[PDB]
Symmetry: C4
Subunit: 33 residues, 4 copies
């Protein structure tokens, strides 16, 4: 744990914020053009 686990929880957190913004842009972009 910690080396192979804590690195998963945090890694995923970085992606969560990444997809969160990539979603508002690609989603909002659809209804905008």
């Amino acid at each position: 744990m910690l080396e192979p686990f804590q690195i998963l929880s945090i890694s995923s957190f970085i992606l969560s914020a990444l997809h969160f913004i990539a979603w508002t842009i690609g989603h909002l972009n659809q209804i905008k053009r």
Copy 2:
């Protein structure tokens, strides 16, 4: 009921549902427009 980690489980709950409804809307629209 931790704090730095409990915010990950809850944060994921808000995103999990947002994606569930967002997927049903953008996916359904994909098979129509």
Copy 3:
């Protein structure tokens, strides 16, 4: 199906698969033309 903890891992798990499939079909539709 335990408290908001195990019931969350399962809920999300069911979504992980749903998104995986919808991705192979919705993505393939893109490379259809």
Copy 4:
């Protein structure tokens, strides 16, 4: 290493990269048409 929930965290890891890598590829479809 755990065992029951173990394989669960792993599966999620595969999707974490599958989404980030797929996003970089499918995103181009948006800026291409």
